[PDB]
């Protein structure tokens, strides 16, 4: 938007890098520390170059505008570490540090690598709330999966890496309308594509991995448009959970419920143990030391 990257402070003495946490949407992400308060913060480092400049301006504008929601990891600020001419400046995107890691981590730190329904129901609702916040502002998340859904040390659920030329990513969370082919040459991301990705995530939570994980990515990409919508393997799960999976995973996107419809789904509303589910989560998080 109206952002000037060269009028940004150097992170020197204001923020510093502690340890690496992982990789994100075009950039590395560190556990950072606020120098004069010792408070933790997530820091995404990106190299500022040709193409990427105006793209950087938009994510910053985006994060400033829409991250003040309780299910969106919050933007703290931005800094440029200016490097010699001819070279790429380093941009530090400073954001709220969700110390419990991703849902993917949660899954692995749970024995058998599956979560309770009550747990899954809580997380999906929170994820949806964040999605509803985004969609209202005409923002598509584009990358919903257990890796981008973070938990805080108070078991709050936050979304990261949203709304941001010839590579193909991992297919397993992609919705049929996103996969370009003969029957569908004009493939673009819809708000309802996020809702499909969420459905996959719910299985990711219920099974430790998404549908078609035991398959070559190119073959999975090929099968997703054609195969019937993925279902829960076991029949152990309640009927409301199975219905919610059916609702999320409607192959034809025109026939797929909108964000607000899924919000009203009984598997989302009927959460009497909400307060309880959160405590179970916070304890399980502490337990990890
Ligand atoms: O998971 C992905 C999520 C997207 C990327 O990093 C983030 C991007 C944006 C903001 C973030 C805030 N807090 C954390 N905190 C945090 C702590 C421990 C983790 N272990 C595994 N991911 C962990 C994320 N990460 C963030 C890369 C990691």
Question: Which residue's alpha carbon is nearest to atom 24 within ligand 1?
Answer: 101
In 3D, which of 281, 283, 289, 250 has the Cα closest to residue 122?
281
212, 159 in Cβ contact below 8 A? no
**Exposed/middle/buried for residue 85 (C-beta within 10 Å: 0-12, 13-18, 19+):** exposed
Tokens of 32: 């950072």
Write the CA distances from 183 to 169, 186, 252, integer angstroms. Answer: 21, 9, 13
Euclidean distance between CA atoms 268 and 214, whole angstroms? 29
| Distance in Å, CA 185 to ligand 1 centroid | 34
Q: Enumerate the domain spans of the chain.
A: 1-97, 98-289
266, 240 in Cβ contact below 8 A? yes
Q: What is the resolution in angstroms?
A: 2.9
212, 170 in Cβ contact below 8 A? no
Among this protein's residues, is 10 annotated catalytic? Answer: no
Write the CA distances from 149 to 72, 136, 153, 155, integer angstroms. Answer: 9, 19, 14, 12
180, 187 in Cβ contact below 8 A? yes
**Exposed/middle/buried for residue 202 (C-beta within 10 Å: 0-12, 13-18, 19+):** buried
Q: 3-state class of 158 per DSSP?
A: strand
45, 51 in Cβ contact below 8 A? no
The CATH code that applies to domain 1-97 is: 3.30.200.20
* Technique of determination: X-ray
Q: Which atom of ligand 1 has the smallest separation from the CA of 160? A: 9
Domain 98-289 classification at class level: mainly alpha
């Amino acid at each position: 938007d109206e952002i000037d990257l060269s009028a940004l402070r150097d992170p020197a003495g204001i923020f510093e890098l502690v340890e690496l946490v992982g990789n994100g949407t075009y950039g590395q992400v560190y556990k950072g520390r606020h120098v004069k308060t010792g408070q933790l913060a997530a820091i995404k480092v990106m190299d500022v170059t040709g193409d990427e400049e105006e793209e950087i301006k938009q994510e910053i504008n985006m994060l400033k505008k829409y991250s003040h929601h309780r299910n969106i990891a919050t933007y703290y600020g931005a800094f440029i570490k200016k490097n010699p001419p001819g070279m790429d400046d380093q941009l530090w995107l400073v954001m709220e540090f969700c110390g419990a890691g991703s849902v993917t981590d949660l899954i692995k730190n749970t024995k058998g690598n599956t979560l309770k329904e009550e747990w899954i129901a809580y997380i999906c609702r929170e994820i949806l709330r964040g999605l509803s916040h985004l969609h209202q502002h005409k923002v598509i998340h584009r990358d919903i999966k257990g890796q981008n859904v973070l938990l805080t040390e108070n078991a709050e659920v936050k979304l990261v890496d949203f709304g941001v030329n010839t590579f193909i990513g991992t297919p397993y969370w992609m919705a049929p309308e996103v996969i370009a082919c003969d029957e569908n040459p004009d493939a673009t991301y819809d708000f309802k594509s996020d809702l499909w990705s969420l459905g996959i995530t719910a299985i990711e939570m219920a099974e430790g991995a998404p549908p078609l994980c035991d398959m070559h990515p190119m073959r999975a990409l090929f099968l997703i448009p054609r195969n019937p919508a993925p279902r829960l393997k076991s029949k152990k799960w309640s009927k409301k959970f199975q219905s919610f999976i059916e609702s999320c995973l409607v192959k034809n996107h025109s026939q797929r419920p909108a964000t607000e419809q899924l919000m009203k789904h009984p598997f989302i509303r009927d959460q009497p143990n909400e307060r309880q589910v959160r405590i179970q989560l916070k304890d399980h998080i502490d337990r990890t030391k």
